[PDB]
């Protein structure tokens, strides 16, 4: 089972893409305009403390 699933670790791309485009399409719909590049370049996401 570990073999079959590791050989299918490529699944992570789907989940990450879905989350990112779930954020970008939602942010773009509230304004009714193509806001994806701006969202990707600008939207700041807290990733830790320093």
């Amino acid at each position: 089972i570990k073999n079959d699933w590791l050989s299918k670790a490529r699944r992570c791309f789907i989940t990450t893409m879905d989350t990112v485009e779930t954020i970008c399409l939602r942010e773009s719909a509230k304004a009714e305009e193509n806001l994806v590049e701006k969202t990707l370049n600008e939207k700041q996401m807290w990733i830790g403390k320093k």
Binding site: D4, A29, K30
Partner: protein
């Protein structure tokens, strides 16, 4: 051949055993189905892992052996293993092999003459591709789409049928030697069976696959989905690529596989017949049934009976519901109230009368339910989820998108629940002339108020004003509705919430039987009035195309073409079995008798008297040539027999056979006065009127096993008569008995005399007598 002998030897070996003999001997054939399950029982928990594990092996595909030897497929093309002599444990008639073999077979194996037949097998998917090629995609946009969860259909389908009807279609298009006894459907719709049969006859194919694909072909896939925009099967099949909750891929799909115009025409026809059959107060119901039965309409190429179409359709509309009730069809749990839709989520009640004074003192009784009752509602581009309580509208939550539709929905809902003072004390304007008996039938108060609101906007505004108006408290401004259906206001209608987003449509897979009264009031095993004739458009004029109202009252043609059509029906009515009839005379080569048949004598006066002789000579000649040789066209014979009454004479034949009404028939070429086609050889179009020909004798084009089925019938078993082949049925004498294997495990006795009288008429007549 030798294969037959092999099958017989195998059967002999099977019977020599003891256990197999027992199981074959006892019971009927249905046990086969049971036995089909006790064998080949094996499943797997995780199929993916098993397949990936297997494919690594040298030989992961079982395969036939003799076919490989025949095709000269060696074990190794070039140092590559493909298979090895062995026997699969379970099958015991197969040899292991590898997947590489397919590639070899694909690139240098045996080639068939033509593979275009696949385009017919999967006509649904090729239709999908053809429809997709005609979509002009405009532009992706982004916005929060409002989606309503509703049941829809996701496959454009023509001539949608039931599972029972379809099963015969598979048997009668592929396996005719094992077809079951002829059903009503097969006899009625013989053009479809012929059309399907031609494509898949004398072809190398896996028959089961074709049958399964025809099953999917005739199944409209109904699904409960979120939806936005118009509702058309052409869109629902690819809705996934048109829009989601946050995006919209605009596209114009109006002109592909139009399926809405035929639904519209069917509803229009049902409205027309329902409005026609209201004249007869005493016997409206019987007139309605007769009116429906004696009518048909064209679908694509075929002509179908309206009664069957109504049964198949799923239009939950007041017009169709009544007609389905009269025929006895069961229908969905869906109410109606004018041009509105309703669905009772919960509650109960019981009728309770109350008076309403129309003007001064004029008591008029009206019935009102007495219990809490929730109701989904649906007016054009608007929806609601209201509730009532003891003659009061407790609340209404609307989620529409238009102000006008919102107001109309609210008004019709208020009327539904008989709330408001007006029901207690009628409006001054409404009078006793309009109250009731427009055509001698009483109209309850609610429908009077409904007509009142439709008559003028001012009445509607007054009605909405009747519901209390309050001041929009803070915060609730958004959830408020003014008189103009405003999203928010300073003053708003009492207890009228407003929201954004259509209310999700409920669902229930239930079928309720419902009767109808003499006044076309559809009761449903309880007081509720599901539908009535007082919720249909008043009237309108329409020119229906490709329809057949073969009924006297529902006809506009004059006595001339009606007389000719009646004469041709009578001539086709002597085509039935039995001696002294057209087919038997043709078999006895007695063409002379045809010239003195009663129906030709009746039809002779119409023939143009100036040149009756010349036409008579030509038509009297053609029949002989057709009759004597044995190669004839039944349709031409019927077309030209009316002219064979009179004595031949001398003259020049221009080419056309006139009547006394300036209408002719040219011998060979189809025209309006008389038409037909080799595709559907079971219809005669006389002045756009469909005359069914019985199937008692084949013709050169129509010749097949089907064209005789009507002639035969079952009778008392006689073991003396012979046992014949299906093909030899053509040669049997009229009024001759014969035994015959039918379907599976059925040996019956058939007598070639047509005895299929109308069953409905006799039962109805006898049952009416029981009430005297």
């Amino acid at each position: 051949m030798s294969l037959l002998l092999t099958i017989a030897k195998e059967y002999k070996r099977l019977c020599q055993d003891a256990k197999a003999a027992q199981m074959m001997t006892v019971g009927t054939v249905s046990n086969y189905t049971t036995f089909k399950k006790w064998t080949t029982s094996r499943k797997e928990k995780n199929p993916s892992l098993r397949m990936r594990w297997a494919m690594s092996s040298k030989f992961p595909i079982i395969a036939n052996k003799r076919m490989l030897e025949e095709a000269q497929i060696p074990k190794e093309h070039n140092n590559v293993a493909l298979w090895e002599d062995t026997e699969d444990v379970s099958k015991r008639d197969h040899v292991l092999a590898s997947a590489s073999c397919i590639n070899y077979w694909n690139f240098c194996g045996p080639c068939v003459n033509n593979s275009e037949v696949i385009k017919e097998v999967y006509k649904s998917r090729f239709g999908r591709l053809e429809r997709r090629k005609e979509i002009m995609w405009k532009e992706l946009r982004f916005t929060l789409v409002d989606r309503q969860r509703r049941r829809v259909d996701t496959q454009p389908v023509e001539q949608r049928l039931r599972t029972g009807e379809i099963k015969d279609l598979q048997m009668w298009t592929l396996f005719e030697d094992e077809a079951p006894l002829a059903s009503k459907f097969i006899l009625d719709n013989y053009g479809l069976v012929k059309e399907m049969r031609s494509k898949f006859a004398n072809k190398p194919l896996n028959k089961e696959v074709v049958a399964h694909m025809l099953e999917k072909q005739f199944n409209p896939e109904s699904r409960f989905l979120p939806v936005f925009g118009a509702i058309r099967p052409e869109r629902m099949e690819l809705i996934h690529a048109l829009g989601g909750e946050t995006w919209i891929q605009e596209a114009n799909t109006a002109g592909i596989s139009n399926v809405d115009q035929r639904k519209n025409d069917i509803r229009a026809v049902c409205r027309k017949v329902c409005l026609a059959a209201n004249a007869s107060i005493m016997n409206a119901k019987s007139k309605l049934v007769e009116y429906i039965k004696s009518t048909s309409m064209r679908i694509g190429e075929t002509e179908r009976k309206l009664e069957e179409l109504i049964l198949e359709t799923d239009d939950v509309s007041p017009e169709v519901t009544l007609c389905k009730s009269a025929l006895g069809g069961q229908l969905g749990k869906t109410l109606s109230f004018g041009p509105m839709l309703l669905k009772k989520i919960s509650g109960s009640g019981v009728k309770v009368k109350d008076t309403v004074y129309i003007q001064g003192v004029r008591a008029v009784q009206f019935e009102y339910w007495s219990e809490q009752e929730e109701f989904y509602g649906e007016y054009k581009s608007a929806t609601a989820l209201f509730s009532r309580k003891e003659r009061s509208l407790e609340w209404i939550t609307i989620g529409g998108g238009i102000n006008e539709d919102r107001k109309r929905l609210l008004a019709m809902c208020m009327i539904f629940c008989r709330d408001g003072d007006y029901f207690k004390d009628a409006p001054a304007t409404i009078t006793m002339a309009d109250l009731s008996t427009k055509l001698g039938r009483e109209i309850p108060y609610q429908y009077v108020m409904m007509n009142w609101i439709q008559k003028s906007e001012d009445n509607l505004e007054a009605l909405l004003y009747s519901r209390g108006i309050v001041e929009t408290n803070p915060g609730k401004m958004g959830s408020s509705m003014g008189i103009d259906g405003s999203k928010r206001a300073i003053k708003s209608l009492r207890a009228v919430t407003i929201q954004s987003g259509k209310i999700d449509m409920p669902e229930s897979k239930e079928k309720i039987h419902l009767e109808l009264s003499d006044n076309l009031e559809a009761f449903d095993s309880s007081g509720r009035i599901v539908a009535t004739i007082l919720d249909l458009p008043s009237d309108k004029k329409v020119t229906f195309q490709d329809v057949s109202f073969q009924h006297p009252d529902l006809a506009v043609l004059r006595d001339e073409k009606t007389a000719i059509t009646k004469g041709y029906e009578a001539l086709i009515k002597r085509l039935g079995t039995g001696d002294n009839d057209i087919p038997s005379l043709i078999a006895k080569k007695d063409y002379l008798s045809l010239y003195n048949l009663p129906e030709v004598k009746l039809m002779a006066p119409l023939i143009r008297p100036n040149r009756k002789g010349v036409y008579s000579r030509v038509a009297r000649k053609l029949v002989s040539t057709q009759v004597t040789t044995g190669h004839y066209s039944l349709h031409e014979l019927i077309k030209v027999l009316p002219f064979t009454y009179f004595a031949p004479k001398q003259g020049m034949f221009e080419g056309r056979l006139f009547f006394s009404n300036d209408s002719f028939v040219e011998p060979g070429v189809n025209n309006n006065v008389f038409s037909w086609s080799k595709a559907d050889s079971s219809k005669i179009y006389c002045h756009g009127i469909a005359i069914r020909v019985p199937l008692v004798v084949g013709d050169e084009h129509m010749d097949t096993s089907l064209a005789l089925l009507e002639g035969f019938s079952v009778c008392e078993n006689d073991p003396r008569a012979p046992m014949v082949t299906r093909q030899d049925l053509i040669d049997v004498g009229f009024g001759q008995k014969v035994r015959l294997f039918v379907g599976q495990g059925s040996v019956r006795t058939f007598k070639r005399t047509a005895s299929q009288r109308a069953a409905s008429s006799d039962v109805n007549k006898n049952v009416k007598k029981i009430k005297m």
